[PDB]
Amino acid sequence: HHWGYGKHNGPEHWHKDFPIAKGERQSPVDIDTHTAKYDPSLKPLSVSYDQATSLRILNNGHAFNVEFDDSQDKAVLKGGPLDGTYRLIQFHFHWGSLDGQGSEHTVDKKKYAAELHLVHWNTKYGDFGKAVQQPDGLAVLGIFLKVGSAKPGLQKVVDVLDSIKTKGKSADFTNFDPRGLLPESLDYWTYPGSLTTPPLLECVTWIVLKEPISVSSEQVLKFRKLNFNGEGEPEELMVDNWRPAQPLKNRQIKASFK
Amino acid sequence: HHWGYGKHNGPEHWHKDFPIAKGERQSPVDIDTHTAKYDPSLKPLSVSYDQATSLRILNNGHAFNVEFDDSQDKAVLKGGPLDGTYRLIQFHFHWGSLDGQGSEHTVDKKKYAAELHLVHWNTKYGDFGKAVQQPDGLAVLGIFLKVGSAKPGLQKVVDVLDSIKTKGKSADFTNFDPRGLLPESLDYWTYPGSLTTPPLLECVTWIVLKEPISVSSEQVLKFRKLNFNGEGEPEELMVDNWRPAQPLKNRQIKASFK
Ligand SMILES: [Zn+2]
Ligand SMILES: [Zn+2]
Ligand SMILES: [Zn+2]
Ligand SMILES: [Zn+2]
Ligand SMILES: [Zn+2]
Ligand SMILES: [Zn+2]
Ligand SMILES: [Zn+2]
Ligand SMILES: [Zn+2]
Ligand SMILES: [Zn+2]
Ligand SMILES: [Zn+2]
Ligand SMILES: [Zn+2]
Ligand SMILES: [Zn+2]
Ligand SMILES: [Zn+2]
């Protein structure tokens, strides 16, 4: 039908329908820790997710999204490299077919098993739709997932995945607390970039956490049981839904830490 | 935030974002039975729905759709005005807030309480996506609903509507037999037209059945309990989701019957 992560509609081909794919501020990128220099003027990141109001979970054929009530400053991101206030709208993941791949961003070319993206939009622009049209419209907080101990806070998400196996399925998903998806340290890298999926708009201040979270082999396995396809179409397992690293070009990646 | 059937985003305004709304082959139309002349060269309609494989039912914020497995020539429409073979992909309805309105097509200006649309695409083009780009890409079989005796075959659909009350909700809907939604006679009118919702593409051969089906006041009342809005958004009842009759212009409506 349209773009995806397969042999013929995958990242390598997105440029055909989405010429910005070859743009100047594309994401993700490889974070080289020898050239991503500590910038002492970067403020600490302020994550306020205590009052986060989750609404639903859905399979859109590309990943699964947990969506939030973003009608108010309830769950917000502030500080770090950000001017003003960015509201949490949704989170989702990218993951691999094998533990050795799955993340979008890489660190010294190292790939993680998965990457969590918490998507926020700039309240200066009134709504998400207007925010995405601006170079400072979104802030995506990127968090690496490594295989290890189970993430207690992830368990509620994993539990409900059998009810959204196929494209277009959704379920009610209230009283989820996204704080349980964070690591201890909020040390980060940051750079100006893009959405990692079509339409690939260059509207994102990327904030990628240094510290990965630990998830269990079982939690990630449940991700890999999702389907790219709709119910009744041929089975195509939702795996390897990551875009590889793109050229940094004339951009600097700044580190919050030494 | 986009097109709909309300005061400010309704059919009267669709021309703003969708200039084809004022095009030459727009649907629906009023079927004037004094000018819609019997054409003895029209073949009888062949409806083959015996092997129809229904998949799911969903609320897309505009109507509810029952979708079908269209990977094979299993549920097809042939003959009548059609060249070749058209596959059933989905059906849906348009209805009113009151019994005296709701249909898209009208017959001598008479409005029915609701209208059923069975949507088929031309197998010559390989898939629906390619078919909609062609003037002969789709065939929509239009069936009027009048208030009267309950339609036994409609009951299974009505039953499951409480589980898809709001926008974005879907449910599994297998082993539905669409033959139960047909009248006895397959006498029809036909004319070249368009989708009655945005993007309003001019790709439809319309086949509208003369004989309405009878549904109960209770069956239609269940339709009117649906919501245009998503779960938790302010309630806007899914009623009066019809486009009024558009100008016929330089088109002829042909009747299969005398
Ligand atoms: Zn190319
Ligand atoms: Zn290096
Ligand atoms: Zn070095
Ligand atoms: Zn180096
Ligand atoms: Zn898509
Ligand atoms: Zn919102
Ligand atoms: Zn992402
Ligand atoms: Zn609910
Ligand atoms: Zn495929
Ligand atoms: Zn106007
Ligand atoms: Zn819509
Ligand atoms: Zn299909
Ligand atoms: Zn319709």
Q: Is A55 close to B129, i.e. CB distance below 8 A?
A: no
B-chain residues near A230 (CB < 8 A) = 55-56
Structural domain range at position B24:
2-258
Yes or no, beta carbons of A232 and B169 under 8 Å apart: no
Distance in angstroms between the alpha carbons of the first and the last residue of chain B:
47
The number of C-alpha atoms within 13 Å of A61 and in the hemisphere containing its C-beta is 12
Annotated binding site of B for Zn(2+): 92, 94, 117
Tokens of B52: 């129809």
Task: Mark yes or no for CB contact B232/A170 under 8 Å.
Answer: no
Peptide linkage before B178 cis (omega within 30 of 0): no
Distance from CA of B256 to the nearest CA of A (A): 36
- B87 Cα to chain A: minimum distance (Å): 16
CB contact under 8 A, A232 and B55: yes
**Distance in angstroms (rounded) separating the CA atoms of residues B253 and B258:** 14
Question: Which 3-state string (H, E, C) describes chain B?
Answer: CCCCCCCCCCHHHHHHHCHHHHCCCCCCCEECCCCCCECCCCCCEEEECCCCCEEEEEECCCCEEEEECCCCCCCEEEECCCCCCEEEEEEEEEECCCCCCCCCCEECCECCCEEEEEEEEEHHHCCHHHHCCCCCCEEEEEEEEEECCCCHHHHHHHHHHHHHCCCCCEEECCCCCHHHHCCCCCCEEEEEECCCCCCCCCCEEEEEECCCEEECHHHHHHHHCCECCCCCCCCCECCCCCCCCCCCCCCCCEECCC
Quick one: which of B117, B98, B139, B123 has its CA closest to B240?
B98
Residues on chain A touching B56 (C-beta within 8 angstroms): 168, 230-232
Shortest CA gap B33–chain A (Å): 41
Mutate to test the interface with B, among A231, A233, A235, A236 (most CBs of B within 10 A): A231
Task: Kindly determine whether residue B55 and residue A230, on different chains, have CB atoms separated by under 8 Å.
Answer: yes
* CA B105 – CA A79 distance, rounded (Å): 57
Mutation pick from B17, B170, B173, B233 vs chain A, by most beta carbons of A within 10 Å, is B170
* Catalytic residue, candidates B1, B62, B105, B120: B62
The CA distance from B138 to the nearest CA of chain A, in Å, is 17
What's the domain count of chain B? 1
Beta bridge partners of B46: B78
Q: Chain B: residue nearest A56 by CA? A: B231
Interface of B with A (CB under 8 A): 1, 53, 55-56, 58, 69, 129, 168-170, 172, 231-232
- The answer to whether the beta carbons of residues A128 and A121 sit under 8 Å apart is yes
Provide, as residue numbers in chain B, all residues whose Cβ is less than 8 Å from the Cβ of A169: 170
Dihedral angle, C-alpha A132, A134, A136, A141, nearest 10 ° = 10
Q: Are B1 and A58 within 8 A, CB to CB?
A: no
Alpha-carbon distance of A147 to A113, in angstroms, equals 7
Resolution (A): 2.2
Strand duo A86-95 + A114-122: pairing:
antiparallel
Report the C-alpha gap between B95 and B116 in whole angstroms. 9
State the smallest CA–CA distance between residue B56 and chain A in angstroms: 8
Q: What backbone torsions phi and psi does residue A31 show, to the nearest 5 degrees?
A: -95, 105
Residues in chain A within 8 Å Cβ distance of B55:
230-232
Beta carbons of A168 and B58 less than 8 Å apart: yes
**Euclidean distance between CA atoms B89 and B53, whole angstroms:** 10
The closest alpha carbon to A17, from A37, A1, A35, belongs to: A1
- Cα–Cα distance between A54 and B138 in angstroms, integer? 40
- Which residues of A are part of the catalytic machinery? 62
The CA A211 to ligand 11 mean position distance, Å, reads 40
The residue whose two tokens read 């959704």 is A170
Who surrounds ion ligand 6 at CB < 5 A? Answer: A 70
Give the relative orientation of helices B217-224 and B152-160 as an angle to the nearest 10 degrees.
30
Residue numbering of the annotated binding site of B for substrate: 196-197
Torsional class of A102: left (φ above 0), alpha (ψ -120 to 50), beta (otherwise): left
Q: What b/e string do you get for A48-80 counting C-beta neighbours within 10 Å, with b at 16 or more?
A: bbeebbbbbbbbebbbbbbbbbbeeebbbbbeb
Q: Which residues from chain A sit within 8 angstroms of residue B169, using beta carbons?
A: 170
Nearest CA-CA partner of B23 in B147, B171, B176, B204: B204
Name the phi and psi angles at B130, rounded to 5: -75, -40
Point out which residues pair with B170 in neighbouring strands.
B58
CATH number at residue A168: 3.10.200.10
Which of A1, A69, A231 has its CB closest to that of B129?
A: A1
